[PDB]
Write a protein that binds this ligand. Structure first.
Ligand SMILES: [Mg+2]
Ligand SMILES: [Mg+2]
Ligand SMILES: [Mg+2]
Ligand SMILES: [Mg+2]
Ligand SMILES: [Mg+2]
Ligand SMILES: [Mg+2]
Ligand SMILES: [Mg+2]
Ligand SMILES: [Mg+2]
Ligand SMILES: [Mg+2]
Ligand SMILES: [Mg+2]
Ligand SMILES: [Mg+2]
Lengths: 134, 260, 226
RNA sequence: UUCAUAAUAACUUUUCGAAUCGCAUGGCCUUGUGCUGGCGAUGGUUCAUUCAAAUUUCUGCCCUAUCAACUUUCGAUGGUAGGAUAGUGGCCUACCAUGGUUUCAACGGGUAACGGGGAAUAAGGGUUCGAUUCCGGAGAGGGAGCCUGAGAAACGGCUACCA
RNA sequence: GAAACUGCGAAUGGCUCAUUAAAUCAGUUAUCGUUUAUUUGAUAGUUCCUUUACUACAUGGAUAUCUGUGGUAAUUCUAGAG
């Protein structure tokens, strides 16, 4: 067998953050990496949480496969996970949508343009409309 | 120049933080508070780099903002609020009450304390003065300023503060042959008894202090915080109990206590 | 030139273009903050009385009241003044300005029509535009009607009724400053605090006096021996 | 200590002592819609506290004698008194005195000189190098001048003038 | 919940090494010689004015974003009006 064996080193329970954090030690044999999803699934039945409340990061294999060292948090509630997790991780998991935002540069430009006018732009537009006769 | 410094590069950072040389251009500068920048300990450092209750700044902020962390009765929502020496850090969830009291090496220790003891802050006295409406008041080196102290409380004396209200329960006078804790410089984190105080005109009062191990050390009076009578300190002291060992002894302890 | 004429009571604005130099010559050498007649200015304006306040020079440098001179003058201005909206909390700037007296170099004269005449101009005097807002303060509301303390607010508030397309809904002003329960409660609490703290202080003082007395006596018991 | 403070006399274009917000909203009836009350935000007077800030003691810099006197009219040194300043002080002004620094290098002149922490160099002593990851300090084209503000003589703030 | 007023913040950071040779600077002093937003603490029954025919306190006064009118070739220029 490939074993796929999971291990949870250093279990720190946070009543502050309502989650159990730990260093996942994972045994590969004859398999390159492990994929986060699978790990989450495995944890979800080990700790009773459901893939959503489990959050695993970190890994990177040691050498010649064999071992991988991650960081798993397991949240007491899924709602809690949603409201304590940084959003990128949630997006990765699939829980939350990627925030549909424009380029940084564009945003900055927009801000600068806004700065160059006082208050609302409706008035300015109206003025421009009258300046067509000029 | 040009106005108060806001930042603190992660180096110029005080070494007793036990911060990392890497992971960030900056350290957290503690805000103003009850303690001196160089000899405080901001909460971002505490709830992360010691207890490992958090894992990054955002997490720490989140923890703070739920308003469960409490420093000395009051809540605190500030990330960098200076929790210095003698600060009682109570967390309602966990029930893990701490009192920030130094290790023998210098660095602040995770001193985990009972909900009965973690109630009173012992506090050194900086000043005895007379304010407005002719009222005498005491200043604690450890931040606070108490209205109306007992006439037999003087300077450089330690004081049991209620913390439940913020008055004086009891006090220890500065006397030779009274248990004392060191809060400054090289001898920082040692405990002992005091043998002599040199009266010294102007240039700092010095204390020759024997510990329990009959090994003298001498420090400045500003660096020394009284802790109780011989046998009875009012505070529970850390593992090591402020005696401090020579390097060899420490090494021996390390390589003898191998229990897998 | 262009005359920026306005009725304040009716609350209406217009710009009237004038090319005839004889009509312009009424305004020459006049300072801003003066009273102008109707009849010489125009045949349309007869019996009318202007007050002159503000204008705009050609090249676009605004008329500031109290510069004097019929010229363009560079000026150092800050907060509280006209012709300058500052971009920093307390910062001066040396702009340019056009003097309060009127010559040929102007493009616009801002004129306020103070007294009526004979011929009503299109819609500036005929048609009215109402107030955008109603009073926000309770006192202000009272002023608007004349009700006295007993009458209360709520009753006379200008509610706006807005339509999205099918759904019709209401928007109402938050009448700041009121005889509301919460305010009263807050006031009471404040009063209580003021009393209570003082009482506590008094008690403390008494206690300390007692303590002192209980030290003085002790002192006297040791002193009388030798 | 003339300190901290308290006391009497007055003082002031009488500083400040809340005409602030949010969510909760219960006990007792003289049954009024009554008397009230909790947690928290903001504020605000001084007093500490801290972040600082100025100043400030002592001691320590690279060459140069082809730099031996320098400094004082227009502050040099000190005095008294003022003015100013957040506060001390030639910080400036009035008046009086004639000091002060120097071969144990003053003052000049240089620097291809920002100063430390440090860097290279591998006996011991050392040499050089430090614009540069930290700490200070200047400076924002050059000189000025100021406004706001706790804090700038700010330069992604003005105000000239010169380039 | 745009805008804008009010508060804060913009004096930190970041860049550079031109000045500058007891200046900076380092260590050590001191501030009984000072200001200090902020943080933390603490901190105002007495504000009245002859004190029985009395004072809104179940709370008192006017101004600025947007609506319309412009100008100027323009630019974080803004006049008048409500
Ligand atoms: Mg309100
Ligand atoms: Mg003097
Ligand atoms: Mg050098
Ligand atoms: Mg350097
Ligand atoms: Mg260079
Ligand atoms: Mg340049
Ligand atoms: Mg800048
Ligand atoms: Mg400048
Ligand atoms: Mg603003
Ligand atoms: Mg800087
Ligand atoms: Mg240079």
């Amino acid at each position: 067998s490939d074993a796929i064996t999971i291990r949870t080193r250093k279990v720190i329970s946070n009543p502050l953050l309502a989650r159990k954090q730990f260093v996942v030690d994972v045994l590969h044999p004859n398999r390159a990496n492990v994929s986060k999803d699978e790990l989450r699934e495995k944890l979800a039945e080990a700790y009773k949480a459901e893939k959503d409340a489990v959050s695993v990061f970190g890994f990177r294999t040691q050498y010649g496969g064999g071992k991988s060292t991650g960081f798993g948090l397991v949240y007491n509630s899924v709602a809690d996970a949603k409201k304590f997790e940084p959003a990128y991780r949630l997006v990765r998991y699939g829980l939350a949508e990627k925030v549909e935002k424009a380029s940084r540069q564009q945003r900055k430009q927009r801000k600068n343009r806004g700065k160059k006018i006082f208050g609302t732009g409706k008035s300015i537009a109206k003025k421009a409309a009258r300046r067509n006769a000029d | 120049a040009r106005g108060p410094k806001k930042h603190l590069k992660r180096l110029a950072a005080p070494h007793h933080w036990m911060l990392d040389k890497l992971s960030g251009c900056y350290a957290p500068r503690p805000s103003a508070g009850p303690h001196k920048l160089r000899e405080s300990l901001p909460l971002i450092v505490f709830l992360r780099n010691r207890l490992k209750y958090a894992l990054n700044g955002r997490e720490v902020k989140a923890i703070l903002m739920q308003r469960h962390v409490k420093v000395d009765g009051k809540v605190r929502t500030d990330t960098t609020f200076p929790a210095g020496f003698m600060d009682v850090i109570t967390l309602e969830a966990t029930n893990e009450n701490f009192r920030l009291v130094y290790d023998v090496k210098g660095r602040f220790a995770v001193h985990r304390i009972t909900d009965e003891e973690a109630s009173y802050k012992l506090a050194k006295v900086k000043k005895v003065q007379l304010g407005k409406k002719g009222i005498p008041y005491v200043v604690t080196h450890d931040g606070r300023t108490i209205r109306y102290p007992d006439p037999n409380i003087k300077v450089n004396d330690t004081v049991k503060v209620d913390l439940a209200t913020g008055t004086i329960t009891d006090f220890i006078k500065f006397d030779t042959g009274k248990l004392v804790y060191v809060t400054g410089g090289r001898n920082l984190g040692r405990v002992g008894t005091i043998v002599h105080r040199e009266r010294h005109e102007g240039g700092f009062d010095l204390v020759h202090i024997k510990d329990s191990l009959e090994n003298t050390f001498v420090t400045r009076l500003n660096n020394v915080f009284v802790i109780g009578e011989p046998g009875r300190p009012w505070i529970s002291l850390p593992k090591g109990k402020g005696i401090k060992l020579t390097i060899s002894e420490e090494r021996d302890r390390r390589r003898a206590q191998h229990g897998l | 030139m262009k005359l920026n004429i306005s009725y304040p009571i009716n609350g209406t604005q217009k710009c009237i273009e004038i090319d005839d130099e004889h009509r312009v010559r009424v305004f020459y050498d006049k300072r801003i903050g003066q009273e102008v007649d109707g009849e010489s200015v125009g045949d349309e304006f007869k019996g009318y009385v202007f007050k002159i306040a503000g204008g705009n020079d050609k090249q676009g440098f605004p008329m500031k009241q109290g510069v004097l001179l019929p010229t363009r003058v560079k000026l150092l201005l800050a907060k509280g003044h006209s012709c300058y909206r500052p971009r920093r909390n307390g910062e001066r700037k040396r702009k340019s300005v056009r003097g309060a007296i009127v010559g040929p170099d102007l493009a616009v004269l801002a004129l306020i029509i103070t007294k009526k005449g004979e011929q009503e101009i299109e819609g500036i005097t005929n048609d009215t535009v109402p107030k955008r807002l109603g009073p926000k303060r309770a006192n202000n509301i009272r002023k608007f009607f004349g009700l006295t303390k007993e009458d209360d607010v709520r009753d006379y508030v200008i509610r706006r009724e807005v339509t999205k397309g099918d759904k019709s809904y209401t928007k109402a002003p938050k009448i700041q400053r009121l005889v509301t329960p919460q305010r009263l409660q807050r006031k009471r609490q404040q009063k209580s605090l003021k009393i209570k703290n003082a009482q506590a202080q008094r008690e403390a003082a008494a206690e300390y006096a007692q303590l002192l007395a209980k030290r003085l006596s002790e002192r006297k018991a040791e002193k009388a021996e030798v």
